């Protein structure tokens, strides 16, 4: 099935970033831990996407913008600042 095939590419990229963390602390990660990240990533995106749906749908609209996204991770405040900053970088375009 289509959805299974993309979970494998997800595991790949989840594998990507976990390694930068492994050199940061000079220490070792379990592979089942790498496996559990791709599962919740994919589980999590379900809620993110369907949430974003209600948000965009609520916006008198059909397609995602920057405001729907910045609504979605309002919960941890280290994150809020992080992302507004990153948004001025991507806004160069």
């Amino acid at each position: 099935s289509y959805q299974q095939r993309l979970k494998a590419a997800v595991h790949y990229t989840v594998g990507c970033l976990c390694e930068e963390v492994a050199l940061d602390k000079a220490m070792q990660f379990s592979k089942q831990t790498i496996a559990a990240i791709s599962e919740l990533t994919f589980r999590q995106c379900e809620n993110f996407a369907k949430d974003l749906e209600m948000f965009a749908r609520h916006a008198k609209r059909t397609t995602i913008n920057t405001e729907d996204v910045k609504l979605l991770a309002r919960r941890s405040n280290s994150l809020l600042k992080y992302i507004t900053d990153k948004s001025e970088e991507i806004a160069q375009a």
Binding site: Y2, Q3, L6, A9, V10, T13, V14, C16, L17, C18, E19, E20, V21, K25, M27, Q28, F29, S30, Q32, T33, A36, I37, L40, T41, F42, Q44, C45, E46, F48, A49, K50, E53, A56, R57, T62, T63, I64, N65, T66, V69, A73, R75, S76, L79, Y82, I83, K86, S87, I90, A91, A93
Partner: protein, 74 residues
């Protein structure tokens, strides 16, 4: 090292309940950043926990103790 522009796109388009939704390029480029913050802070919390209860390596147990916290942030 890490998230393709295309990856996040595919992933989102998979679970859209309305298919009218496309994603603007910048909004796409922000999610690589959001997915970046997401996974690595899950990873950082696994390690902080391995360290807290006095351990040799980062295992399932420690992560599932920090699971509450991650859900709360996302």
């Amino acid at each position: 090292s890490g998230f393709r522009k295309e990856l996040v796109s595919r992933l989102l388009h998979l679970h859209f309940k309305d298919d009218k939704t496309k994603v603007s390029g910048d909004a796409l480029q922000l999610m690589v950043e959001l997915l970046k913050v997401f996974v690595v802070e899950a990873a950082v919390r696994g390690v902080r926990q391995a360290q807290a209860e006095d351990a040799l390596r980062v295992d399932v147990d420690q992560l599932e103790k920090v699971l509450p916290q991650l859900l709360l942030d996302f």
